[PDB]
Design a protein around this ligand. Sequence first.
Ligand SMILES: Nc1ncnc2c1ncn2[C@@H]1O[C@H](COP(=O)(O)OP(=O)(O)O)[C@@H](O)[C@H]1O
Ligand SMILES: Nc1ncnc2c1ncn2[C@@H]1O[C@H](COP(=O)(O)OP(=O)(O)O)[C@@H](O)[C@H]1O
Ligand code: BEF
Ligand code: BEF
Lengths: 759, 759
Amino acid sequence: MEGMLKGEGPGPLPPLLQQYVELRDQYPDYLLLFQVGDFYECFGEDAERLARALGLVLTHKTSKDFTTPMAGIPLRAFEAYAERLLKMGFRLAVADQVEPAEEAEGLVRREVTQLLTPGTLLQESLLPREANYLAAIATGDGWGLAFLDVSTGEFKGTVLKSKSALYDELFRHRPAEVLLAPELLENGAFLDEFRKRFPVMLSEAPFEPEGEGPLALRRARGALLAYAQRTQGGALSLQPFRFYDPGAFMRLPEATLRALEVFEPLRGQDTLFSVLDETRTAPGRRLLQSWLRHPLLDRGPLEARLDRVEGFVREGALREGVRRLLYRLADLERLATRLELGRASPKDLGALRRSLQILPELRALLGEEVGLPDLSPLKEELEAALVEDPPLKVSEGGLIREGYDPDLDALRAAHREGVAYFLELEERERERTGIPTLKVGYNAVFGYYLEVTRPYYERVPKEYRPVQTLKDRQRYTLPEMKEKEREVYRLEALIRRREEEVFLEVRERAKRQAEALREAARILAELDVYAALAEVAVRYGYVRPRFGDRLQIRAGRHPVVERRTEFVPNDLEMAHELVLITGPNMAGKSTFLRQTALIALLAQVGSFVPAEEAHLPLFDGIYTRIGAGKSTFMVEMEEVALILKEATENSLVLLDEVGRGTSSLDGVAIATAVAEALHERRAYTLFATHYFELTALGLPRLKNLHVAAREEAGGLVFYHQVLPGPASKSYGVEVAAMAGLPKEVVARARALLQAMAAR
Amino acid sequence: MEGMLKGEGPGPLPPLLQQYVELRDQYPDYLLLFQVGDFYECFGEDAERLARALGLVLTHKTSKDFTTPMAGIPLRAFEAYAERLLKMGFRLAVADQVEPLVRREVTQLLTPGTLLQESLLPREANYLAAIATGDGWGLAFLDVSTGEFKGTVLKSKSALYDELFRHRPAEVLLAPELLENGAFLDEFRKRFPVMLSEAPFEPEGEGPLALRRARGALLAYAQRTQGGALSLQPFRFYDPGAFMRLPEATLRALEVFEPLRGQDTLFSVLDETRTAPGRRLLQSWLRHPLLDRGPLEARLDRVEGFVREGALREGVRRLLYRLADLERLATRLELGRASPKDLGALRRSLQILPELRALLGEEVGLPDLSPLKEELEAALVEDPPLKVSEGGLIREGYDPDLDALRAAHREGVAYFLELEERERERTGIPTLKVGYNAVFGYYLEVTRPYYERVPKEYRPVQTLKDRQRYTLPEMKEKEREVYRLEALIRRREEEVFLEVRERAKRQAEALREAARILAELDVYAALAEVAVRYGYVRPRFGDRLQIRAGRHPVVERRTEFVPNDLEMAHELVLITGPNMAGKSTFLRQTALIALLAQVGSFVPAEEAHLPLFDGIYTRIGASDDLAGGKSTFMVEMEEVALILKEATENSLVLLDEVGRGTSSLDGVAIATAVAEALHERRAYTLFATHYFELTALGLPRLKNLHVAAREEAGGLVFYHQVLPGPASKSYGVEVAAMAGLPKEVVARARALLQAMAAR
DNA sequence: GCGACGCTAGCGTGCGGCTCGTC
DNA sequence: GGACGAGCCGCCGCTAGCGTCG
Ligand SMILES: Nc1ncnc2c1ncn2[C@@H]1O[C@H](COP(=O)(O)OP(=O)(O)O)[C@@H](O)[C@H]1O
Ligand SMILES: Nc1ncnc2c1ncn2[C@@H]1O[C@H](COP(=O)(O)OP(=O)(O)O)[C@@H](O)[C@H]1O
Ligand code: BEF
Ligand code: BEF
């Protein structure tokens, strides 16, 4: 069994290393950072792991019995070191010195304070502005999926019917850490797939149900709670749990978000989010992200969001003001969580103090209708307790302003006089002794002292007690000092105790405002997004979309591509029609299909869109077969299957070259069958193809569009007008030619084309 | 800004920072790492970068009239950060404090393609490339770590890239004409993501102007790095036409050196060498396969040698295990950079050399370096320490002078161990210590308790927390002596070390000759090991290609591979069949076999009679990876054009589905003209395609082959057997069926398929 | 016939703070 | 000749080695 450390030597394990091992083996998969004084240390293999991982120095902690390897980091840089460690894949186990030193039974009590897992981080220097989720998956009457953002308290979940939907929902939440139920972990088949499709860190957790509802959900939830309650090291700050339904929002499958680069890019470029997000606050960025993750289906609310956006678009003044003020707004939502969790530092409070000071100016600028809570009381007391620039930890310098604590002002009082004492003494001695240069100094090793140089050694009085000798200076002590020096130390010792209580007292004051803090967060967060979205409209020429059943876009732009190029706008009019798009490659097709999707996605999120006029329907889902079973033809078909099993007459469907990857024959066939399928389905379908045949089909709701090329001076020039009607001819041979194919070889190809043409 | 440091304050740069800025300014395009004690420091704006790129602790360097930000890395961790900093595109300038107003100067210059330090280099060659212009392109490569100096003159920018790619340079030097040509540079970067450095191009040597100029850039640049004359072997001018052509398309398609992601390259599978020189040799061969049968048959003979002599093969492979890189070691010695540790490595190698000569025999021609090995065994500790000062380097009894000094020194230490035993044996203080410190030298140390038992013959010099250190009259001389010696011991030991290092440096050639012979042996012996392990057979060369049961060398190491036969002879061999059956793999094994053979290795087959191809030109698919404007089609055609302009009747061409990516018509049209062009070309063409039309062109040298699939259990199972003659079916619809396409859609497709047969 | 306490010099990650040598 | 390198002690806590209760 386990209970032994690494290295060389016989005899027993020292009292300390003993305590080290005892905790170290309770968290087997965590790197234990042992708190020994002003350092976090690791011994044995764990010590070696550290040293190399962080390039630290490898030393040893020797004792009678044996000597073991040692590696440590100064607490000062804990988080600094933590971050690096985490990014490498380690879960940290922070073992701190609970009870103070001065009142310990020899060996200071040490227990693991908190656990640092990638998806349960609370340290604000370790978290992104974006939401950081922990996700749990379980089975038992369908698939159970739940999320928890330990830093904000967001706690939600749902149950999905397929393994497809689970992954979709999971992928739109971009979970930073996943808990897999027993069943799934065992099943080597599943796990492989999951681990392959979601390269996120996995972790063990008990899936004993919790609360009420579908068995699956109760297990996933219990898992989250169990795991997080362990890493926080105490009760969690949870928000009402949401058992939501993803059928109430627009469907954004994984293949759509990826292909559409909503959140992640394909060519290390920009993404829809990147381009759109100009929020100033973090909760704001979070909200906006939430909105994209699940676009609305309901006309009313969207037309609510669009009004407020339009508001700031008009009120340029106001818009720039609210944004000017939000620049200074801190993450109240998270700050409120840290407070409730009793983790709020003076730094946090200082920040809270600044944020709350902004409130009134926002109130004025927008009017008392904003509904912002009145925290003026809390705001003020903070300004009256904290220093203009709050320190990091309490025990150190001044945190509480002078004149706020009677008990503490008397302390700084006594200390000022006490220090002045030693100053007075210097001059008293410089006279009695006649030694002009005599200094009165201090230092940790010997305390307050009287200093005299060599030229005056024979001039020092009997009374002076030698304390320290130096190259050419000697330091003495008088009895008086000895006393007054301890009066200073006792004051200082009392000053910390109190300055820290006053802090804790004031903190708790802010902690009773957590809820108020939280609602201000929400209001300010929407405020942030609304102004942001408007900021984006103005800067980039977006316009308010109008919803209806007919989609009529006028001078369209792909919101991301136009960001890095003179983009040629284009039109579109669809209505449950089948719209084939033909024309030479490099012409514009796909930069057209994608454009359509994004426009739709922005509108149904409450944002203005990149066009001149846009009349859009409320799509129940955007499905794509763009870009991306051993073969390529099978993979693409697997997708068409999916798309075909969920698209409704209210889905926007985008097909790019479906039918490629096989024989010409099976090509057209499958394409035709599929095109006919989406046609009956009655969904809005854009199909970019190379089979001109599909354009001639005998379908009632079939429309045709095309892009073109003009063979001019230097070969072919591709314009991007998406003109009406089908493409006339193919430019393959022309392109090949342009690509350098030997002129005789091209000529031969032209002859063959014209021969086959003659039937 | 020269003389300017990003900081706050008026007054001049203090002495130190003044030095810093002086060097900093000499190597502008580099990040200057300044030594300060046990750290490498950066100041001003540079310090902010160092801090940024490595996420360090930004702080400040302060003097009365100026304070600037600083950041640094431990003198030790250097080579570890250098790597990160190098990979980040940083060029480093190292300044070391000339071994004791210090005197700091720029020791090295760390650059991607000029690295000399072993811990920063790969076993493989590391080149610095330069390209110039002047009747064709000038290409010259240099590997400062080896001395390898070669070059050639290319006629087309197309051939240029190729040769530049075969070598995978680490850093390139473009001539000014090229740097100014906005289009080229815009293209070069896009196609060759690698560090580009500036460097003079004043011609050097003889031959073409473009070569001499490139050759000059190299020399000029590299010397700046290795601060002084370079150690290089005779410039080797070569002709790419003297070897088999291996263009970048083929090198990637075939994954000779790098995988298309999803590990395992021909090289990794093939590479089984035990030394670096060997790995470099074998890589060299793979890079330029031979045309001439003479040499090839010579290599095959050597390989067979070890396939026969198992005891010899196994004995040599054992001995070479971990054997050091004599070639690089020789260079370091010649460059005057060899570390004590290096000499240590060298002797180990020399100790093993005698055993290898036993096994092989005089035939081989290894140099007898026993004298050098006896010397190194006589002077170096059984673990020289490059890092630990430079002392504890020469062993006792090697050099009398040094020996006498160390001995004298030691007595002193003894004395200061007697004063200890003697004193406490008079003062009763069995505690009293005799330690030393730089500040005062030697002393006496007494703890707090014994101040009452401390005699007056003493003279306190320094007091500490729990103890105080005293002095004595009869102790100074014995200090000013121990030191005068510790100094001399350094002065002398370094002399000897240098003397020793020099003796090794005089054997540079013997070391290079040894390295080289062993490299061959290592290679032949490894090509044998591989043949024996995976069943490779010696190939025979003749105008007909005949491979009996050949397997893809790389693919098989991962699965049960089905071997296949092939009989070609200047024929157009089409391969049809369902995807997922094996068409593309087949083309690739055929190509890899041809390569292994013309590299002098055995092949993965039973019988292999192969023609000596002049080049292997592939068009094995991928396309659209820059993934920009260019349609995949266009990219594929450019490649085809390349082949048509290169392929001769003695070329092995592999066309994989050429024609896809456009209209079905142009598709077949282009695909037929190409197939025809290659037919008349009379080159060995393997064309996997889906256009059955090609299957029936009826050309005199046309031939059919195909793979198939059966209908087992549920759907389709692909057997991997390449049968003679064409396929007659397409399993598109069948596959969509397995894909999960709605039965109706599938049925609709089939109805369509046949409905076309009425044609 | 030795378990139990007390006193207390000393080491040690990384790194402020203190000291000392020189123009 | 007050200021600038350049380098040692010790932090906070735990231990081992010594006396000693009796
Ligand atoms: N309307 C447009 N305005 C400006 N650039 C465009 C437009 N449409 C396409 N492009 C650009 O032309 C190139 C080819 O477009 P893509 O949609 O991929 O074409 P297709 O399927 O037609 O080949 C891309 O670089 C794309 O960004
Ligand atoms: N000779 C062979 N022996 C064993 N597996 C093979 C062989 N040839 C191909 N395969 C496997 O068959 C699958 C399809 O082969 P691939 O060459 O891609 O075929 P294609 O162009 O016919 O689709 C791959 O998984 C590949 O690794
Ligand atoms: F990118 Be497009 F569909 F060719
Ligand atoms: F790889 Be094969 F051409 F599908």
